Amino acid sequence: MQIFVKTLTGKTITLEVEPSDTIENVKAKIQDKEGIPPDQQRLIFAGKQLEDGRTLSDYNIQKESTLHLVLRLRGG
């Protein structure tokens, strides 16, 4: 299956994934595509900040879902 990632500029990249892929994996593909290291990436879906250890299917992220890329944020 495929998914989409909306990058900072609004530009949308498409990613080849399996549902068993971790968010880390996705981040690595994004790093390959966008040159942003994973520790600086945050992926938002349904308003959740997705967690590195969980998988795409753990979040019910299915084909042609869009994940929104964001930079590391810290509430203080």
Partner: protein, 76 residues
């Protein structure tokens, strides 16, 4: 589309005299100048938060200039 690859993440227009940071990210010379003239050390890449303890001197990426120039001259 590469119309988007070739657009600056600061001004959202096609790169104008783009410049490439050592972290591999591109900005209109003016946009990046403005960004890092605004602040003092440390200087961060808008795209990946790569940290520069001083402002790196950069010249324009002539290949990317010319590619955009071709893109645009062709469009007209």
């Amino acid at each position: 589309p590469l119309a988007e690859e070739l657009s600056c993440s600061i001004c959202l227009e096609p790169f104008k005299e783009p410049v490439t940071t050592p972290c591999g990210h591109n900005f209109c010379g003016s946009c990046l100048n403005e960004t890092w003239a605004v602040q003092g050390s440390p200087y961060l890449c808008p795209q990946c938060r790569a940290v520069y303890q001083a402002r790196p001197q950069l010249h324009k990426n002539t290949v990317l200039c010319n590619v955009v120039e071709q893109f645009l001259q062709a469009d007209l």
